[PDB]
């Protein structure tokens, strides 16, 4: 069921999980919750999501609570500004330390509590 896009395969899950149980599932399939590093990747992802919410690899790191990618892609604060839903990350209830694709727009991301269950997206490199 993996979908191919620009050097990577993507798994859009059929069952919802917490952010971490999702990441564990991805790792068991030799992947990670997806990073997003271009406008074209964001578009591929939200279009494929078809209006449903999917955990991606966004999660907090460091004392300052900076956002990061679980697959260790450096997080670019400047280049990613255009990818959040206006008002996000708003850190609701001071307990939203993971990120998902929520809105069907380039401005797609929301921070939500890591312990809520959602469908999720894994990303796995193709290595020729
Ligand atoms: C009302 O709460 C929801 O909407 C806000 C944005 O208005 C979001 O910022 C907030 O994360 C989201 N909560 C959950 C649990 O998904
Ligand atoms: Ca939020």
Residue numbers in the entry: 198 to 325
What are the paper's exact sentences on this?
The extracellular portion of langerin contains a C-type carbohydrate recognition domain (CRD)2 that binds sugars and a neck region that mediates formation of trimers stabilized by a coiled-coil of α-helices. As in other C-type lectins, the CRD of langerin contains a primary Ca2+-dependent sugar-binding site where Ca2+ forms direct coordination bonds with two vicinal hydroxyl groups of a monosaccharide.
A commonly occurring single nucleotide polymorphism (SNP) in human langerin results in change of one of these lysine residues, Lys-313, to isoleucine. The position of α-Me-GlcNAc bound to the CRD of langerin-I313, is analogous the position of mannose in the wild type CRD described previously. The 3- and 4-OH groups of the sugar are coordinated to the principal Ca2+ and form hydrogen bonds with Glu-293 and Asn-307 and with Asn-287 and Glu-285, respectively. An alternate rotamer of the Ile-313 side chain brings it into direct van der Waals contact with the N-acetyl group of the GlcNAc. Interestingly, langerin-I313 shows enhanced binding of many GlcNAc-terminated glycans, for example glycans 536, 584, 547, 177, 179, and 531, as compared with wild type langerin, which binds only weakly to these glycans.
